[PDB]
Design a protein around this ligand. Structure first.
Ligand SMILES: Nc1ncnc2c1ncn2[C@@H]1O[C@H](COP(=O)(O)OP(=O)(O)OP(O)(O)=S)[C@@H](O)[C@H]1O
Ligand SMILES: Nc1ncnc2c1ncn2[C@@H]1O[C@H](COP(=O)(O)OP(=O)(O)OP(O)(O)=S)[C@@H](O)[C@H]1O
Ligand SMILES: Nc1ncnc2c1ncn2[C@@H]1O[C@H](COP(=O)(O)OP(=O)(O)OP(O)(O)=S)[C@@H](O)[C@H]1O
Ligand SMILES: Nc1ncnc2c1ncn2[C@@H]1O[C@H](COP(=O)(O)OP(=O)(O)OP(O)(O)=S)[C@@H](O)[C@H]1O
Ligand SMILES: Nc1ncnc2c1ncn2[C@@H]1O[C@H](COP(=O)(O)OP(=O)(O)O)[C@@H](O)[C@H]1O
Ligand SMILES: Nc1ncnc2c1ncn2[C@@H]1O[C@H](COP(=O)(O)OP(=O)(O)O)[C@@H](O)[C@H]1O
Ligand SMILES: [Mg+2]
Ligand SMILES: [Mg+2]
Ligand SMILES: [Mg+2]
Ligand SMILES: [Mg+2]
Ligand SMILES: [Mg+2]
Lengths: 18, 583, 464, 95, 189, 95, 81
């Protein structure tokens, strides 16, 4: 009767003011 | 867009990339795809090292050489660099401007192709925002229109799990499967590439050397692919010559040099064994007999099997030797295996099979399947053999383990390889598999109910047949039954145990001398056929170690001094005399 | 691909999106805009933005019928014909739709059928330098579909035809006896090339059950070498546990091992035409047999990713050792009994009746006869000779010596494997000592004869 | 004394003694006093719990891919924490 | 470690894929071999070809620091590779080489240092020494079959007891100076 | 905690691998021992070599929080390491 | 509903400068608080049990004047019980 046990950061772009 | 793209044709003419030999069908298919009215984008999907980048870059070399169709005579291939495009795209729209400008230039010329190596990267090209906008989305409309042609190259793993995810992009790219070349194809490729490698290393490769490298690489090096595998051996062999002495073998590299390089890469014993190795092998049986007295047949089988593999008469795809050691307790099944590793100076992969009693424990040896907590751990057996390919695999107390474990060792004995949960394939060709079993120990010691006590040696074999499935026994090279430990052999064991005590005693500065009379007394007092040689340790411990330890801790032997042991026949007891050597 | 406009901007400060700029206008209804998206993207991306999804009116689009697709090709025929300067026959366009849908499954019917037309025109345009052939024949369409789908089915070549005829003869030379097994494999493979093959099943699904030492795996392994196809050997002892079966079809999405994918489906995809040797299938968990049931009848297996692997051209050979103890079991009584029937009953117990019905044939390998063993001894000697050739040694074994080796090692129950052991002790062991230290170190010669008086072999080594 | 003196087996534990005797004869107590006299940890383990074969997994832990694998083995972890100790196994026969 | 170092020179002198990889268990001395080459280079014990070559060590954290802006990571990685190519006699040493597979990249993005460095390694323009444990090499590095092909594995087997005593004797002047004590010969053995 | 503290100083004075690790059960004064070293240094009850040293307690939670970028964690972590590297005497504590 | 949030919860507790009140469901406590040793040590479990039948009516009666004033109509004592 055994049982088997199964087992954010992104770059951004900047826009300078026109 | 010179910064982002490089012209392969220009590089081919002055410097060169690589001469392309063969792959006529692969090039014809790629060229046909490029000539299509729509979706004329070939994708060279293949295993690593097959030559996916050679075909794409070989087309430029072929075009300058002129061995191509007239339509492709004016075509020019550009190699895009994803890193260069994203070198300075900090501001919004910078990448789009550079990428759109590059595609626009191709449309104007209308007689050029783009070679994007490792095309799986562009599915996730630089996208600051979460929006799906990326190079794949930008290039998708142009691909369907047919304005531009773009060659691709990616592995099966990357294509299936990254490129396929994007259904729209996959439709535009016509998959072209690249298959590993045959042995004959690979040797021809090396001959064409041989001048390029000969010039760099200033060596000349013999015809035998190139053929041996391809054949030897396939036999021993399994993880890599044949075209890449053969070039690695050929390239490395040339490097050694440059680093060899000034004039010993600079002119040419013989087959012997190729055989040595293959051995180092695969960590297998080199062919054409040295005289030093021959001396060790010739005296392996003699040296093993000194440590393990008796059981010469077992030592002979191990030494003879090891001699065959090194000689070159080993099994094609089986281990050096598979031996099942069955015998009464104390015979020395584990000791001979342990000493074999020490004598040969190879790692001893000792596995206690008692631990793997339940079926679930089988996962430890091969690792847990994908999607479980144990995937990272891997397989103890697979990882151990991979780290130490040449080793002695000692599966002690194999009978204790569940029959499921026996099934796992079927491919090892016959196929010679085992597969890990991650998919890695282990090589058992050079490992010596020794399995010690205590089956029939109860039967052999047991005395039959009869006037004459029948020898129960035969009975033990019957349990072996029941415990082990017939297929398992057939794969074994031989079953070496340890008969018994004789009285004469036990006399030698006493000397061996005393020698072990002497080295331990040497550390404390005390020297022990045992008379021949005392040695015979120990053997008769503790000789037990059923228990083998283990009682010898107990009698020696009580008779000799216990008095010495008391004296050593508190007494004359605190400081190293000679001790003398003699037998008194009148009392039939050992006499221990201690003489201090401090002054 | 209107899913893209939902985003398109995340720069600091602006906090603007294309969908938000057009959201008031769409709500007002002054401007109307058409859009297209994939079913997966609409449910996962477009549906998330309820405002856009609410406004837009979905119009389902699905693959057209076979008749409708050929009509489309005829409509598009002037464009493709003009570019390639080729003309397509009415039968050729019909063949492309029927052949492509039959063999190509991943792509949908419209592009899949057109892909053959475009490639067919390019091949016809590019194949002859003289441009002798401009029209596209039906035969050309078949060849193009074959390469795209990587199926060996095509008109048999003269070079390939010869090899097919001698496949049985060559297999017999390497594997002696077991003629029924070789005939079943050769005949099934011949049918596939001829075209008399199952529409949605593998060419062959053979279960090999026999005594230990018989050449069940060897015939399967040698078949791949003779046919020049890859051998997808999958040892089934590793898959004893139920959870391990997922490894074959891939781990469910969201786990550590999902990316690696299935080992069976990926291998079959990489090598569509190959021999799938599932050795020791008996040891595998019952769940493994369930997966194979689908492959035998449906002809395709879906992995965790959802890709389907085509087993139509795969030769499925599953070796089993079920009921092997009965084979070596010695029945009580003066005369031993044939336990072949008992072994079949064990196979029936282990394998479900439905599984056996799907299998093309179940071949019971017979025990090796004395005559067969004599050939086996010669085969092993040839392997030894090849190994000796690498070291520059030549071995000559007399006929009397070969008979002596056969009798010493011939065991019906154990099989051919004992013969190898006899060769190792009698021949390899003496040569090994001489090879390492002796006359055979360099350029050796060897002769073997049987001493009739002493009934023991004599090994004569010449340094040469 | 022999092990500390340097005349030990060097590959086996200090001692493996099976104390078989009638109830209340002092077999368990002598081991407890030995630890106190030596000032070493006493790794008391009751073997009555391991009545059946499956319970043995607890001593060495569950294998990878099964529940309780992270927990580890009580016997292995206990010895690791206390290398010098007395490993008492009461009611060994009942196991 | 002459045999281990000798193979490294052979790999470094290869026309293509001249990237030696030092795979061994922790504590064996892989970093010592990678850094020891630089020490021997100054002394001149290494072969003439190796002489006059500068070995650099890559700090993954420094390269990825302050790279939030798109393309900053690529600029730094492509700038360093350009430097190595221009010199033609510089060898890069990437300790814990498995880290480049998981270098700076977006969640969706698959562009990493491994993909960028892959073309240069195959061509042979740049030589890159590596160091990683057996566990990381098999569970992470080997998974990337493309990257593994470019790197040549060099097995490192821990030294014997006899070999180890000489290593301590060579490192004894440094430990003695820091602790201002002298280690007896018997103590080292 | 003289015995426990003495072991820590010996490790810290080592030329290499001078990173003591305190392992114990919950609520055994594990954190207090590391914090106590700072208190002892302030009172000058430690050896002369230990004197004139600073103990820094790194907060993993604060460092991880607020990065929201690939290089934010690396830059702050590398910045922290630079400060410790600049001062040879300085020591770090990571609970 | 602290269980909904549970990186910064541990540092404020460890510092001890500001004490924090946390309301979590019994099921969530076992799933989150019991599993995390650090969170469990800092937080003290205060058992909040439902009032008895007599207590429940008393609470309504205590709060009944507020309700009656709000809408200007009252409930009989029999009705609330
Ligand atoms: N037909 C061929 N002719 C000549 N060289 C070949 C051929 N096929 C492969 N090569 C060699 O292959 C090497 C180039 O790498 P490829 O085999 O194309 O793999 P790759 O594209 O780098 O693999 P990935 O994409 O990184 S997994 C060089 O050594 C080539 O000489
Ligand atoms: N033939 C032998 N000569 C010398 N020492 C021996 C011999 N056989 C056993 N010993 C010693 O006996 C002890 C136990 O040896 P093992 O190899 O474990 O015995 P074994 O008979 O293989 O044990 P099991 O329990 O039956 S697997 C060691 O001290 C060995 O050195
Ligand atoms: N019929 C045969 N003809 C020629 N060689 C054979 C034959 N049967 C076995 N052999 C030899 O035995 C080896 C091949 O054995 P396999 O066919 O792989 O065994 P198997 O069928 O997997 O065994 P089991 O015990 O049934 S699992 C090679 O050395 C062959 O030369
Ligand atoms: N051959 C050697 N010569 C000199 N010192 C060595 C040698 N091998 C090991 N050492 C010493 O042992 C350490 C080797 O460096 P380590 O950083 O331990 O290498 P490593 O085992 O590759 O590292 P990781 O971090 O475990 S991958 C240093 O303290 C060296 O002084
Ligand atoms: N030889 C003895 N000397 C002193 N007390 C003893 C002795 N034998 C038994 N006892 C008493 O019994 C206890 C030990 O009983 P124990 O050995 O655990 O019993 P059992 O063998 O039945 O499990 C001691 O702590 C003491 O109370
Ligand atoms: N040796 C000691 N000297 C002084 N205070 C101690 C000592 N041991 C424990 N304490 C007190 O008890 C606490 C033990 O908790 P601590 O070891 O910090 O827990 P944890 O290891 O779970 O982080 C200390 O913070 C301190 O208040
Ligand atoms: Mg490539
Ligand atoms: Mg043993
Ligand atoms: Mg088989
Ligand atoms: Mg008791
Ligand atoms: Mg290191």
């Amino acid at each position: 009767k055994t049982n088997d046990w199964l087992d954010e950061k992104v770059r951004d772009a900047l826009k300078p003011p026109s | 867009t010179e910064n982002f793209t490089t012209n392969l044709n220009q590089l081919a003419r002055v410097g060169g990339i690589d001469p392309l030999i063969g792959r006529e069908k692969e090039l014809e298919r790629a060229i046909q795809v490029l000539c299509r009215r729509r979706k004329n984008n070939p994708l060279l999907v293949g295993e690593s090292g097959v030559g996916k980048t050679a075909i794409a870059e070989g087309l430029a070399w072929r075009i300058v050489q002129g061995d191509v169709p007239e339509v492709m005579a004016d075509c020019t291939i550009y190699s895009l660099d994803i890193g260069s495009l994203l070198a300075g795209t900090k501001y919004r729209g910078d990448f789009e401007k550079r990428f759109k400008a590059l595609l626009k230039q191709l449309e104007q010329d209308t007689n050029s192709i783009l070679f994007i190596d490792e095309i799986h990267t562009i599915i996730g090209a630089g996208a600051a925002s979460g929006g799906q906008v990326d190079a794949a989305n930008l290039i998708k409309p142009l691909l369907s229109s047919g304005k531009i042609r773009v060659i691709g190259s990616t592995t099966y793993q990357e294509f299936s799990n990254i490129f396929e995810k994007d259904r729209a992009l996959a439709r535009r790219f016509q998959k072209i499967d690249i298959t590993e070349p045959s042995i004959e194809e690979t040797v021809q490729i090396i001959n064409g590439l041989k001048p390029k490698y000969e010039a760099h290393h200033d060596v000349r490769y013999t015809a035998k050397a190139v053929r041996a490298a391809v054949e030897l690489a396939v036999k021993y090096i399994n993880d890599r692919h044949l075209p890449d595998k053969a070039i690695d051996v050929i390239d490395e062999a040339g490097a050694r010559a440059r680093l060899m002495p000034v004039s010993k073998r600079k002119k040419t590299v013989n087959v012997a040099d190729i055989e040595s390089v293959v051995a180092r890469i695969a960590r297998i014993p080199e062919k054409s064994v040295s005289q030093s190795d021959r001396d060790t092998l010739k005296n392996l049986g003699d040296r093993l007999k000194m440590l393990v007295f008796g059981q010469d047949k077992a030592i002979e089988a191990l030494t003879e099997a090891i001699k065959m593999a090194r000689a070159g008469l080993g099994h094609e795809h089986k281990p050096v030797g598979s031996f099942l050691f069955a015998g009464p307790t104390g015979v020395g099944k584990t000791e001979v295996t342990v000493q074999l590793s020490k004598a040969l100076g190879i790692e001893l992969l000792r596995f206690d099979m008692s631990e793997y009693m339940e079926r679930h424990t089988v996962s430890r040896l091969i690792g847990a399947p994908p999607g479980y907590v144990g995937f990272d751990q891997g397989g103890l057996l697979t990882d151990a053999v991979i780290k130490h390919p040449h080793a002695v695999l000692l599966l002690d107390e194999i009978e204790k383990a569940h029959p499921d474990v026996f099934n796992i060792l079927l491919q090892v004995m016959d196929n010679g390889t085992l597969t890990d949960n991650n998919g890695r394939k282990a090589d058992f060709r050079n490992v010596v598999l020794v399995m010690t079993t205590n089956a029939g120990v109860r039967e052999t010691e047991r005395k039959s109910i009869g006037l004459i006590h029948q020898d129960n040696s035969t009975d033990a074999m019957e349990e072996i047949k029941k415990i082990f499935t017939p297929e398992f026994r057939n794969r074994l090279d031989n079953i070496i039954w340890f008969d018994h430990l004789s009285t004469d052999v036990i006399h030698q064991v006493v000397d061996k145990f005393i020698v072990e005590l002497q080295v331990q005693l040497d550390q404390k500065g005390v020297s022990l001398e045992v008379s021949q009379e005392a040695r015979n007394w120990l053997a008769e007092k503790g000789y037990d056929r059923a228990m083998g040689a283990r009682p010898m340790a107990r009698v020696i411990q009580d008779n000799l170690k216990k008095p010495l330890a008391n004296e050593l801790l508190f007494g004359s032997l605190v400081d190293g001094g000679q001790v003398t042991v003699a037998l008194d026949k009148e009392k039939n007891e050992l006499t221990y005399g201690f003489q201090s050597a401090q002054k």
